[PDB]
Each structure stands twice: as C-alpha cells, then as structure tokens.
Amino acid sequence: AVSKVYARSVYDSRGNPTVEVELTTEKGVFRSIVPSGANTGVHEALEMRDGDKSKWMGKGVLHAVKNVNDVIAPAFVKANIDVKDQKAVDDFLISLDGTANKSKLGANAILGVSLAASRAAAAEKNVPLYKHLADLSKSKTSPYVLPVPFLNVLNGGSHAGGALALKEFMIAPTGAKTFAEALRIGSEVYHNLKSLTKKRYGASAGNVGDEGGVAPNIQTAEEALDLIVDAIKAAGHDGKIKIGLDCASSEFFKDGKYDLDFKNPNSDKSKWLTGPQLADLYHSLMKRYPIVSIEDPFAEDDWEAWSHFFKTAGIQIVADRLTVTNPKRIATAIEKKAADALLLKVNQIGTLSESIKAAQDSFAAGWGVMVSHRSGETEDTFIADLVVGLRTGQIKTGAPARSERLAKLNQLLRIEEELGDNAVFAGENFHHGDKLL
Amino acid sequence: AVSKVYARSVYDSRGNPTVEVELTTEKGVFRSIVPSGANTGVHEALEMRDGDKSKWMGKGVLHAVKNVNDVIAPAFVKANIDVKDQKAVDDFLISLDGTANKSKLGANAILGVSLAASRAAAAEKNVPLYKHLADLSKSKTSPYVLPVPFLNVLNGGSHAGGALALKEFMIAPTGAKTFAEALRIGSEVYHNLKSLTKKRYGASAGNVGDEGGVAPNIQTAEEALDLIVDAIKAAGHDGKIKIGLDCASSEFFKDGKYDLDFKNPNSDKSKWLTGPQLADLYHSLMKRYPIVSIEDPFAEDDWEAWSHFFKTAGIQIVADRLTVTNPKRIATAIEKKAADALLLKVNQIGTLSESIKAAQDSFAAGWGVMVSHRSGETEDTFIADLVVGLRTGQIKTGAPARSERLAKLNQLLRIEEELGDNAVFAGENFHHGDKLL
Numbered sequence: 025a026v027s028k029v030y031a032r033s034v035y036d037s038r039g040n041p042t043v044e045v046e047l048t049t050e051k052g053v054f055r056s057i058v059p060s061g062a063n064t065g066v067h068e069a070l071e072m073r074d075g076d077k078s079k080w081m082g083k084g085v086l087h088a089v090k091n092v093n094d095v096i097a098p099a100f101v102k103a104n105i106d107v108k109d110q111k112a113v114d115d116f117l118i119s120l121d122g123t124a125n126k127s128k129l130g131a132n133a134i135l136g137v138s139l140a141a142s143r144a145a146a147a148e149k150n151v152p153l154y155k156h157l158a159d160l161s162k163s164k165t166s167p168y169v170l171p172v173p174f175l176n177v178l179n180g181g182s183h184a185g186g187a188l189a190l191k192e193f194m195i196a197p198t199g200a201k202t203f204a205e206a207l208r209i210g211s212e213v214y215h216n217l218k219s220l221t222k223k224r225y226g227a228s229a230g231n232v233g234d235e236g237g238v239a240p241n242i243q244t245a246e247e248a249l250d251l252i253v254d255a256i257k258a259a260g261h262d263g264k265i266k267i268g269l270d271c272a273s274s275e276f277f278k279d280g281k282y283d284l285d286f287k288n289p290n291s292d293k294s295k296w297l298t299g300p301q302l303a304d305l306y307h308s309l310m311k312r313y314p315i316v317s318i319e320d321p322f323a324e325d326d327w328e329a330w331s332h333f334f335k336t337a338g339i340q341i342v343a344d345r346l347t348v349t350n351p352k353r354i355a356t357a358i359e360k361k362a363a364d365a366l367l368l369k370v371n372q373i374g375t376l377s378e379s380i381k382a383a384q385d386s387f388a389a390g391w392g393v394m395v396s397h398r399s400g401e402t403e404d405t406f407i408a409d410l411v412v413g414l415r416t417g418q419i420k421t422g423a424p425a426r427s428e429r430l431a432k433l434n435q436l437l438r439i440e441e442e443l444g445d446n447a448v449f450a451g452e453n454f455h456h457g458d459k460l461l
Numbered sequence: 462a463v464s465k466v467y468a469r470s471v472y473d474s475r476g477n478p479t480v481e482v483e484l485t486t487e488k489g490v491f492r493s494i495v496p497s498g499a500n501t502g503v504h505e506a507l508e509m510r511d512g513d514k515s516k517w518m519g520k521g522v523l524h525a526v527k528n529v530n531d532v533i534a535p536a537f538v539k540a541n542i543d544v545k546d547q548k549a550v551d552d553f554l555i556s557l558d559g560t561a562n563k564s565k566l567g568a569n570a571i572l573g574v575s576l577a578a579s580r581a582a583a584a585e586k587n588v589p590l591y592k593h594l595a596d597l598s599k600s601k602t603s604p605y606v607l608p609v610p611f612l613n614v615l616n617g618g619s620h621a622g623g624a625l626a627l628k629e630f631m632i633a634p635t636g637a638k639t640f641a642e643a644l645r646i647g648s649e650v651y652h653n654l655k656s657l658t659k660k661r662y663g664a665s666a667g668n669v670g671d672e673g674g675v676a677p678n679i680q681t682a683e684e685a686l687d688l689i690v691d692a693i694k695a696a697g698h699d700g701k702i703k704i705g706l707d708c709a710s711s712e713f714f715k716d717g718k719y720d721l722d723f724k725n726p727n728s729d730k731s732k733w734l735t736g737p738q739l740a741d742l743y744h745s746l747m748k749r750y751p752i753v754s755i756e757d758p759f760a761e762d763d764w765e766a767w768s769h770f771f772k773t774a775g776i777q778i779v780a781d782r783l784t785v786t787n788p789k790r791i792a793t794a795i796e797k798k799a800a801d802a803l804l805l806k807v808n809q810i811g812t813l814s815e816s817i818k819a820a821q822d823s824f825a826a827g828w829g830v831m832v833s834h835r836s837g838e839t840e841d842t843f844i845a846d847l848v849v850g851l852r853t854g855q856i857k858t859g860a861p862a863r864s865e866r867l868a869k870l871n872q873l874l875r876i877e878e879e880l881g882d883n884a885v886f887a888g889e890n891f892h893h894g895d896k897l898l
C-alpha cells in the first residue's frame with residue numbers, strides 16, 4: 025500500500041528547518057511535520073542537524089532528509105508494511121536505525137514516517153485520525169474526553185529579559201463546561217494580559233515569545249503571577265481559571281545546585297540552592313497562587329529532589345526532561361515516585377508506538393498525561409488528534425496566539441463539534457481524564 | 462455537486478475569532494479560513510463583528526457564521542452551482558447579499574464560500590489549486606512563475622514603542638536563484654537581525670510582532686534600515702537582498718498633513734509634513750538603501766500626493782489602502798497614475814472573482830501585483846496557490862517566523878518542488894512577473 029516515502033525541508037515557527045514527510049498510498053498523500061525544541065532534554069532521541077555553519081547557521085536537516093529518501097524510503101516501500109499495524113511500522117523503523125537513541129538515522133528522520141503512516145491508516149480505515157489513535161492505544165471512545173488546554177500566557181527563563189528564572193506560566197480553564205468555552209475565556213484572559221502588560225511594561229512588552237505568550241522584563245515568579253492573577257480578575261474569570269507552571273529547572277541546574285540568577289553573569293555559589301531550598305520556593309508559590317500543575321520543578325537526573333518534593337506537593341507534578349517520553353525512564357520515575365504526570369512529546373522518543381506505550385505506562389501507574397507541543401512548532405495538527413485519541417484530558421500547545429498554536433486549538437474545536445454528545449470536557453478531572461466514566 | 466456549506470468560528474493568529482467555511486462535494490470536504498486586518502481601510506468590504514463586549518471583547522463572528530449557515534448555505538445548495546465556474550459562484554454570493562460593500566451578510570461570510578468553492582473545483586478537475594487558479598485568471602502555465610517573498614523582519618508604526626512611524630520593513634531576496642534559496646537566505650538575514658537586535662536593544666527586543674518581525678523601540682527609519690543592512694551583511698547576502706517598505710501612512714495622516722511623531726501625544730503640529738516634504742524623506746531613504754518597493758507612502762484618499770510622488774519614485778509603488786483590491790478604485794489609481802502595483806488582499810473585496818479582476822486590471826495597465834496576507838492570519842495557505850496561479854512574481858506573507866506565515870512559505874516550497882522545470886523564480890523581474898516569457 026505505501027508506494028512512496030518522501031522527505032523535504034520545511035520551516036518551523038522559529039524559521040528553522042525541519043523534516044516534512046509525505047507517504048503516498050492508494051488512498052492519497054499523507055504528510056507529517058517534525059517539531060523541534062530548544063535547550064532540549066539531554067536524554068532525548070537524536071535530532072540530527074547538518075552543522076554546516078554556512079547555511080541556516082548550522083541548523084539544516086539535509087542529512088536527516090537524505091536518510092528518509094535514500095535509506096528509509098526504499099526499505100520501507102519494499103517491506104510491504106500494513107500501515108494500520110502501527111507497531112509493525114515503528115518496529116521496522118526502529119530496527120533500521122538500530123541504536124538506543126535513534127542516532128544512526130535521527131529521530132527527526134524516523135518520526136515523520138511513523139506519524140504519516142498513522143494518517144494513511146486512518147484514511148484506509150475511513151475514520152478520523154483521533155478515532156484511529158484511540159484504536160491504536162485501546163482507549164475508550166464512549167464518551168471521548170476533550171482536554172483542558174494549558175495555555176501559555178507569559179514566558180520567563182533563558183530567552184526573556186529580566187531575572188525571572190521559571191520558563192512557562194500557563195492558564196488552564198478547568199472550570200469551563202465545554203472546550204469551546206475554555207478556549208474563549210482563555211483568549212479573553214490572554215488579551216486582558218497583553219493590555220495590562222503594555223500599560224505597565226511599555227508598548228513593546230506586548231510582543232510575543234516563541235510559544236505566543238508575552239515575555240517582558242520580569243524579575244520574580246511572584247511578579248509574573250500577580251500579573252496573571254490581575255488579568256484573570258480583569259477578565260472576570262476567577263474560579264474558572266487555574267494556573268500551571270513549567271519551571272524548566274534543568275536550565276538553571278549546575279554542579280548539583282539551582283542558580284535562579286542563572287542569567288546574571290556573576291552568580292554567587294552561596295545562594296545556588298539545594299533541592300529542598302528550591303522546593304521551599306514552590307511551596308510558597310502554591311500557598312499564594314491557584315497553581316494546579318508544576319512541570320520540571322527539578323533537573324533531568326536529580327531523582328532524590330523529585331522524590332522528596334513529590335511526597336507532599338499535593339498537586340499535579342509533570343515530568344518533561346526527567347522522562348523524555350521514554351518508557352525506560354518513565355519506569356524509573358514511577359518506581360521512585362518522582363512525579364505523577366508525563367509530558368508527552370512524540371519527538372523526544374521518535375515514534376508514535378513508543379509514545380503510546382509511554383502514555384499507557386503512565387496511566388497504568390495512575391499518572392496523568394499532558395500531550396505537548398514543542399517550542400518550535402509547525403502547521404501540523406497531529407497532537408490535537410492525539411490528546412483526544414489518548415483521552416488524557418489535558419494538552420499544552422501554546423498561547424492563543426501564533427497559528428502553530430491555534431492550528432491545534434482549532435483542530436480541537438472541529439473535533440469537539442464533530443463528536444457532539446459523544447465527547448465530554450475534562451474540566452476539574454484533567455489529571456485523570458482517561459478514567460472519566 | 463455541492464451538498465453542504467457549513468461555517469464555524471476558529472481563532473486567527475492574534476487569538477481573535479474568524480470565519481472558517483467547509484464545502485462538501487462528491488470529492489470531499491473543502492475548507493477555507495478568512496483572515497483579518499488591523500485598522501482596516503475605510504473602503505474595505507465589511508468585516509462583520511458581533512460587538513458583544515461580554516464575548517471575545519466584542520470581536521465575535523457568530524453573526525457572520527449564522528449568515529453562512531442560515532442564509533447562504535440553503536440558498537447556495539439549492540442554486541446547483543457549478544463550482545468550476547468561479548464567476549457564477551461569486552455572482553450568486555454577491556447577488557444574495559445585495560449590497561455594494563457586502564454589509565448585509567459580511568465579507569467574512571462570503572469570502573469563505575468563494576475560496577472553498579475554488580478548492581472544490583480544483584478537486585473536480587483533478588488539478589492542483591494553483592493550476593485551477595491559473596485557469597480562472599487565464600494566466601500562462603508554461604512556465605509558472607514562483608514569487609519573490611517580501612519578508613517582514615522589523616516593524617514600527619502604531620503598535621510598536623519608540624517613535625518610528627513607518628509600519629513594515631521587509632527584505633526581498635530578488636537575487637536568489639530559486640524560491641527555496643530565497644527562503645533560506647531570507648531566514649538567515651532574519652535570524653542575524655534577531656540576534657543583532659537582542660544584542661543592541663536587550664533580550665526582550667527579540668520578541669515578535671503580529672507578522673513575526675522584531676519590534677524594538679526604534680526612533681528613526683534610518684536606525685531601522687541601518688540594522689537591516691547590518692543583518693544582510695552579517696548573513697553574507699549583500700546585493701542579493703533588497704528592501705520593501707509599508708509606510709501605512711494613513712495611520713499618521715491628520716488635518717491634510719503627515720505626523721511622523723504621531724505616537725507622541727503632544728506631537729508638534731508645525732512639524733507635520735505636506736506630501737512633497739514627506740516625499741523628500743522617501744527620496745532620501747530610496748537613495749541610501751536598497752529599497753525596491755514602497756507601499757502606501759500617502760494616505761488612502763490623498764490622491765494628489767500619490768500622483769505627484771509616483772512620477773518621481775523610480776521604483777515600484779504599491780497601493781494597499783488606496784485601492785482596497787477594488788477594481789473601481791484601481792481604475793481611478795491607473796487613471797491618476799498614482800502607483801504601479803496592487804497589494805491584493807482577497808478579504809478587502811470579499812470574493813475570489815473580484816480579486817482576480819483586480820489583478821487582471823492591474824497587469825493590463827502594466828502594474829505589478831503583490832499578493833498579501835493580513836496581519837491576522839491563519840493556517841490557511843490559499844494565497845500561496847493564488848500568487849503562483851496569478852503568476853505575479855511577488856508575495857508578502859510575513860516574517861519567516863510564526864506558522865500563519867510559514868504555512869504559506871512552506872506551501873510555496875512544495876509547489877516549487879512539484880513543478881520542477883516547469884516553474885521559474887521571478888527574481889529581479891518580480892515587478893513584471895506576469896510577463897516573463
């Protein structure tokens with residue numbers, strides 16, 4: 025059924041090259057695009073870049089593209105794989121690479137094929153993608169569950185001015201009754217926030233960062249959080265809207281400690297914090313603000329810190345760089361009681377099947393799963409169909425600005441509309457969306 | 462042939478609702494989304510908004526959506542229209558609305574149906590959208606012409622801080638050998654500019670405006686243009702990259718004069734410029750920098766300023782708000798020798814048919830045509846196929862950042878690839894791309 029496998033370079037939302045794959049079958053042409061992160065988990069599967077400093081500042085994907093076209097394609101076509109057998113598709117791809125971290129072909133060569141095969145499979149089966157993905161993952165479909173969108177509204181951290189160390193501040197309309205309502209009220213808080221931001225930080229403070237949130241010179245998480253609370257209140261949405269954070273603590277972890285002044289070029293080791301000290305910051309924030317989720321509070325291999333904090337955190341704790349959507353690392357994180365939610369980024373692992381396994385393992389342990397974009401996204405809408413397919417009840421796909429973000433949120437509106445009464449909104453139950461009766 | 466017409470609200474790139482329309486035929490479901498401008502020309506066809514302050518801050522499009530579903534749809538289906546006949550599709554739509562500027566139904570209701578019909582028709586014909594649009598406009602297809610992209614890299618004007626009064630500064634890789642090369646070298650100039658900008662103005666100055674350009678607090682057009690020239694040189698593309706401006710001068714036209722300090726609440730009235738005074742500024746820029754296109758140098762109805770300048774410019778002058786993609790205004794502009802290029806915005810006039818006629822009337826007069834996005838865009842890629850089909854040789858569709866821009870740029874990559882030797886890059890001949898042999 026697959027007659028052609030073809031890759032090209034296209035541009036992600038930051039204007040950097042990435043791999044787009046097209047699979048041709050009797051049912052037509054099926055396209056998937058590979059996303060890209062920044063300051064990525066050190067344990068993520070290989071994102072292969074050309075490193076030709078003379079083109080694209082070394083970020084070309086000509087090499088990965090060649091791997092699709094000259095290596096994967098002729099082997100994939102001749103193998104007569106049934107695309108409906110996602111496991112077979114991905115087992116073949118993994119077998120062809122032959123390395124733990126897809127370092128022979130690149131995860132960005134393999135993933136596009138994995139994802140395109142699933143769209144081709146849905147076409148063959150004459151079902152929408154989300155229905156096929158539920159089939160693949162054996163998720164229940166009566167009712168489907170539409171996710172709470174965790175909307176980035178403000179960014180701090182390594183790519184913003186000011187001293188604010190924490191990376192993502194998100195609003196989650198857990199109190200909304202429908203996904204349509206969630207997106208609307210979230211857009212309204214967003215606009216209220218841009219307005220307040222411009223009034224307080226200047227006209228330019230309205231400009232947006234990579235994920236679409238405002239990113240002005242902010243000094244402390246409390247400053248950011250007071251600001252967001254002000255916007256929520258102004259928009260009249262207190263008590264339908266809660267807050268999520270992504271600390272991205274791996275970006276300020278050095279030598280075993282946490283440097284919150286990691287931007288400040290002369291940081292004093294005397295106030296680099298231990299895990300417990302940093303845990304005390306998060307505790308203070310929790311007491312003061314309506315935070316319902318915290319992601320990467322500690323660094324990607326700092327197990328003792330995660331495990332100590334998790335006992336008493338009492339809210340959703342999400343693993344991103346800790347777990348890297350990798351069933352092996354997820355197993356450890358479960359055993360160590362380090363977290364209770366997986367941030368699922370398909371390109372961290374490089375195949376759909378491994379990503380589905382990642383999610384099944386997390387649900388089995390009573391963990392939640394937040395499906396997630398990358399900071400470098402594209403017009404590809406796969407993750408919208410995925411979060412519904414896996415019935416997780418929560419997605420993180422950016423601010424309600426920039427269309428590499430709206431593209432997913434818009435796909436969710438279409439999915440919501442298509443399903444009518446055969447879908448529920450996750451709402452207060454986002455953590456265990458998969459277990460909703 | 463058409464069995465259903467259906468509209469829904471989706472979100473544009475700024476997180477404001479807009480209208481998406483799906484047409485269903487024997488060949489599938491065909492989707493179009495309507496973009497949205499800021500500070501729209503007074504002569505533009507009506508964009509109907511709901512004005513319910515308790516929802517999306519009055520920016521809802523539920524009335525327009527209702528217009529499609531309750532009014533257009535039943536009548537359109539019962540009319541048994543041949544979607545291949547775009548003129549028929551559009552004559553039906555405009556004669557249903559019955560008002561000159563589409564104020565009964567809304568241009569944001571009509572346009573979605575118009576565009577979706579063209580996609581439906583390409584499918585019936587078993588041809589790519591660009592080929593069908595060529596057929597519709599009687600454009601030659603041997604070879605097709607790929608456009609030079611005018612890429613936003615920097616903005617000033619009403620929504621930027623600092624004093625800079627002109628709106629858009631674009632780079633145009635006219636010296637590139639292919640579209641693909643154009644997009645690479647353009648991406649490189651953009652990133653070099655982003656880095657130089659963060660270095661000079663601070664990390665926050667790297668955040669992006671609506672169209673994906675940087676928007677630092679810049680004080681003069683010279684400062685902006687010197688930065689761009691620095692970035693071109695740094696990226697190693699001297700000579701191969703030219704500059705375009707959109708002055709958006711209508712936003713600073715007051716009391717018959719032009720206020721270049723319009724962002725100052727106490728701007729000095731005695732320093733406001735007459736048309737000829739302003740023209741002398743543009744002359745200075747034109748001679749000092751590799752500027753090959755200036756858009757909206759004078760206000761939307763300041764006809765005499767345009768006609769007096771145009772004689773003197775010696776470079777492409779583009780009408781955007783003057784002409785509003787309207788054949789009646791375009792005729793006047795041609796008669797008054799006010800410009801020599803149309804900025805073609807399908808949603809300024811509201812149907813594809815009127816838009817083609819606008820372009821045709823332009824080429825007929827020896828004008829160029831620059832196909833254009835709106836500042837509020839979506840994941841919709843129609844205008845990529847339009848610019849290729851109309852054979853214009855130039856498109857303005859954003860910075861190489863934010864996927865409502867890359868979506869179009871990526872679609873052009875695909876088209877270029879698919880056409881191979883049956884396409885040529887407009888390059889230095891962008892102005893008269895339609896007349897390439």
Ligand SMILES: [Mg+2]
Nearest residue numbers: 270272320344
């Ligand atoms: Mg993270």
Ligand SMILES: [Mg+2]
Nearest residue numbers: 707756757781
């Ligand atoms: Mg303009």
